[PDB]
Amino acid sequence: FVVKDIHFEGLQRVAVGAALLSMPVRTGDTVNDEDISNTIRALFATGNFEDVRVLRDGDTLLVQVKERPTIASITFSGNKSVKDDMLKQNLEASGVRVGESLDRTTIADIEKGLEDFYYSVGKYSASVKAVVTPLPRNRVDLKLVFQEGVSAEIQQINIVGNHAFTTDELISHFQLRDEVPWWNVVGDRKYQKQKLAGDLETLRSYYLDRGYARFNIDSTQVSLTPDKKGIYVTVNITEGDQYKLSGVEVSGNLAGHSAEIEQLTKIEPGELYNGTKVTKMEDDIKKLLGRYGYAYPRVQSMPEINDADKTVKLRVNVDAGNRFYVRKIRFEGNDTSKDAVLRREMRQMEGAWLGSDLVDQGKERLNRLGFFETVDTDTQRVPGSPDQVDVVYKVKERNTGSFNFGIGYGTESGVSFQAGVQQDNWLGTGYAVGINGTKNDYQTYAELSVTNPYFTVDGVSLGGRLFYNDFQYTNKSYGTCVTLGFPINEYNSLRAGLGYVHNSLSNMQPQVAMWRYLYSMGEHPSTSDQDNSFKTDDFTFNYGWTYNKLDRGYFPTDGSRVNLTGKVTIPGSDNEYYKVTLDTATYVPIDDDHKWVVLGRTRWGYGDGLGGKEMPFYENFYAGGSSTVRGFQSNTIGPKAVYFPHQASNYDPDYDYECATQDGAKDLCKSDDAVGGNAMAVASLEFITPTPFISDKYANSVRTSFFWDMGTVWDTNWDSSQYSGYPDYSDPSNIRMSAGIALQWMSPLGPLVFSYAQPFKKYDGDKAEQFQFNIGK
Amino acid sequence: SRYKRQVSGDEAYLEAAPLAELHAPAGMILPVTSGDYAIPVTNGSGAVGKALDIRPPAQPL
Amino acid sequence: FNSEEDVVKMSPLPTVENQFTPTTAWSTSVGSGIGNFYSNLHPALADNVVYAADRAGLVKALNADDGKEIWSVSLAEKPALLSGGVTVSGGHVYIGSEKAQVYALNTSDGTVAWQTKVAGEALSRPVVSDGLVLIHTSNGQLQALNEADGAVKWTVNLDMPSLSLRGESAPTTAFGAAVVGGDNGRVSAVLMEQGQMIWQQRISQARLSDVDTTPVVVNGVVFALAYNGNLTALDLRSGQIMWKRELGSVNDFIVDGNRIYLVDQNDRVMALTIDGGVTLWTQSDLLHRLLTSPVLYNGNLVVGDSEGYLHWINVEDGRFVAQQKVDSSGFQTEPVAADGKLLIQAKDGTVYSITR
């Protein structure tokens, strides 16, 4: 038989010609019902529909397909334990391509696939139901809906065959947990498959670090309870024996450096074997080769374990390879940022030997910009060269700027208005511009600031700032400064600058510590009534220094920090004075492991007039509160004012009663309100010891200490002789001390600080605040 | 969208400086060209700049 | 800071008048119990003495008529995780542990006879036959031990899934040959004297389908079943599948009067006819409420709840018939089919003797 024509109707998804070319036998071929059935199989292989009718009644064949809704829209009823994008991408990867094809068999498949996914995440109780409805033009809409219990609690993790260490010490280092105590209840019994495997690697590493070189995790299994809501984890250990390390022998094509490689691998023959020791030792070897430019060394460490005695010798094989040169650096994704803004701060040098530590130090320094969400990196060899590498950094531009506006209200407070605009990386120039501005019923403030962190290509930052700061004692002030800050060493920053500030003090209450200054300035104000002003212009040279080699950065264990700042006015200022600050923190460990530490912090300040003028009272030093000595109200430690009686005072006697209200006092009021001194000397000695409740999962994060504080502030030219009746503020010996406890906690909501302090040594008027709280000190 | 200055079509890519190949002095030759190569001159009647109708062809199918 | 969810919505405690007044005759507290830790620690009987233990390690022997204990030993260092059914034969009580120990105790005074490490935790109850103790461990190893010494005579290894139900599958013996279950759906048998392998059979497709349940053997027919698997009957001589049912099972089953009594994964109870997977009756009542092993006592099938109740079901009729007291924190391990008696241990460490 021969077929002369083929009939089709519909063809909604696929044209007749595409079917005929897909079919094995075609118009004009010799065919029989077996061949026609093979064409129907070809229709099924392309996958239109399974329901068909076929008729032969002549030299032409008729075939019809029963087209049925297949072109599916997908929706899910929400998802209380998986993310929407993960759900949809799992669905699409599982196979339900939106608008491709969908069938009752595929609906069963996707149900089971999502079920098995849900079981893979660990909500083994979960159920998935999928329903479809049909739509004109062969379309369907598919909804699937989920039910689940709480994901199963792991019961007792148990280790078996162990004898060197107790089971509770082994599982306590797991990230899976048997128990969550009454405290730190943030822990959870969530099984994770990938974390269980990591916990086996932690168990293996612990035994190798304890020196059981023969150790083997011979087997493990996990089990689920019948009600499908609880999990057991069991691990089998073969411990072998504890081993002693014999001296390392190093061999292979070391391209020199062999004397340093020797020094790096010398180990005394009495030490235990240790897994992290060999891996740390191997890592130094390849990093040492890297530093000299052998960017891709080959190194292997092989343990020669003995059985006749408990000794093992490490064999380390090294070859240096080629001395790769960085023939290109590229930055990709560096939209909206000047390239020099990256190249200037990335550290590895193009056209030079590849220090792989220098490439990674670049990656760190780019992150310290904060301009980028992530700094990915690659190094790739140029095709057709054995010897040369292109370094590439790939960055995601973080949205660096911020813009803010706001308003406030309340009859007891008045109108409030606030604004702000910040943009680190201004137009990508790497300048940091920042404007602020605030108004209330009384205060006005505005600030404009610019820093150019590379005024000179070596990293000399230059800054510039303007401020207006207007308050109502009434004080309108405004000014400027410009600064240069340039590092002199890795540990040792230095900076300098010039400033200008104007001050317009007015209606300040008459008091000795302030009037002494005004008389020294050659102003002779009234003492009897609160009507005065003292305008001045001032020009200053500002300097500072910062030594900082603190090891850990977060909670340093060892090292020291020393900040210094100072001011002199320059001739032409109305004020003529100088001031100096020294501000230090030394850490020294008092155990060989850095478990126990003691601090000594100190602050020293000083200032004086020059040329017979006097230091302006608004620059006076203050002490007390969390920053300085604990257990005293913030700043209240200095000498307290004594007001002159000025019964022509502020308007209303119904307010909180002033010194010399309209009906008030008539002598010098020894105040309860603190004023700073021109001199300052604070110390604290602080012992760090771990809590009774540590475990190493968090003992690094709850820095607890016992401290002794010692503070004073004094007013070096308060002429005690003339004021016989009032306590001597010129006496530096009024040292006031406190002790207490402190607890520094890094938990997610912030670097909290808790403290309680007892002022075992204080004087009249020192407002005590024993319990204190702070963040981020 | 940030590109709003660009997709509305600037003229500013015109009057870019014309290309001019360097000529070597005697006793040397310039490096051999290795990429991003000189485009064939292909001068013709095609429109340029804002005269070019960026829309899809006069019949879309 | 917290949230919770649920799926199965278990049955709302169907209940009926306690017609036969079944009630505790006596009860004793041995100590703590298994608590939340699913583990087949259950008491056992010999010569009118009932023996019971606390998963912490403490073990007692009690008189069955009145419940006063005669022993106390710790089995522990100065917890043992003592775990697995107490088994008793003649001079010796045998107990497993989740710490790879098997303990033997003297039935005359409760002194520790001997202790030997087995390959992994012995979640199976020990079983004594032919003068040997057989233990099945979670590492998939049958081990046969000398009853006077615990010395291993032979050992046999089985395939372990990457995820299982608890691998108890305690062995059984007939004609001097052992039969055992296992994970990954394997039935197997071995020669008791030497551990030679006999035929093995794959119960079903596998997705968990562990044959976690002890296979009973009667007249040469082995019955075996699995979680989401199939119940099957097997020729002890050849392992030919006599018949199957698509009914799975989850904890235990019993053959008595050549009739099959089951607990489905849906905590429903049914009896199946002599051969072929067809039900005489189904009690669909207790759905998704964890049921203990059903015990046939004095013509009534007794099953314990996850909570305090004991439910009484007719031996051949499709009737649910009685509901005893709400015993303390309910049950999670199999009662013992003692002759003319009942003994069941609650989750908390309270043991109960029941009469009607």
Place this chain on the structure above:
Amino acid sequence: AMAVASLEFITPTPFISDKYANSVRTSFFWDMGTVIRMSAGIALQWMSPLGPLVFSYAQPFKKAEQFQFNIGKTW
């Protein structure tokens, strides 16, 4: 130094059609801060091409910041 910590529970206002109420939130919150004081507050939020906008009413139990309007956008 300034420190603030806050916790809140949501109950959105349906004043506008669900379509526009999808871009709206209403929330009730408690906070503690040292500047030590504790406070409770009511908040309304909306989003626009201008960025996100908040209007808020609050009472500090130590009694003030009792009425605020706020905007804050990254660029």
Place this chain on the structure above:
Amino acid sequence: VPDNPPNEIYATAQQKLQDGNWRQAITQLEALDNRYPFGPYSQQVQLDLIYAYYKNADLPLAQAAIDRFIRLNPTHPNIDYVMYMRGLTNMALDDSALQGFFGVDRSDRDPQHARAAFSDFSKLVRGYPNSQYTTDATKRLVFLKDRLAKYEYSVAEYYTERGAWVAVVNRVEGMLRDYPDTQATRDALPLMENAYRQMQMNAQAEKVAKIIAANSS
């Protein structure tokens, strides 16, 4: 976005596109594309949808739609138009953000979108030299090569300040072999002369001096 019983969605959407209501156009074209994916309004629709995405400045989606078209119909009779739009979409990603409003010459920012664009337009005019687009595409190519060369000079300028004299010479040599005829290469020759001189490589310094002295205006 809307219910479209009739294909009339294409005629009114074309009117919205002619009106430049790009919002309306993309949403109605997307609806038409989703509802009539295999009719005559498919090839006829993808082109307008590409054009609407470009004018909407929705360039990541424009890339995907153009990439889809070239993959699904590599021989369409106006595929040269699709190549021109490929280059123009990639070139539109180069002039990103508010720069130029402040007068920022952003020619130093990441050139990869520019370098891609140059590949696309060069592929066009090499393939279809009779097309009307070749005049603009060649104007687009001369700007794109000068913009790349200004980038390479910018890095040569930076390493001149950092004094990484090998990094200077090795890149300005790269310009002479990859970008010889641009003005930025002619501006770079002093940096090569300087770099050779600081390295005491006077012979090369004199050679580059002979080059520049022969080619200065």
Place this chain on the structure above:
Amino acid sequence: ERVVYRPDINQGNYLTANDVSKIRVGMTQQQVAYALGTPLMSDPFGTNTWFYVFRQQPGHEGVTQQTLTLTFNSSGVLTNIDNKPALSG
């Protein structure tokens, strides 16, 4: 005075005494590249000469440079050496 902390400037090929003593008249060009590594600088203007430069500015203000210029005839055979061990400033 200048005192700012520059990182170490380093540029070009690494040189050592035991690597330069490998080069002698009449070697083929691939042998030089094998002994010293690939030339990070060459004459692009159409004469086959390689400029192995080793340069450092260590620490505060020290400067050092070695230059090794190699001249090859066509087909890549070495004809002459010009080694300067220190910067002739």
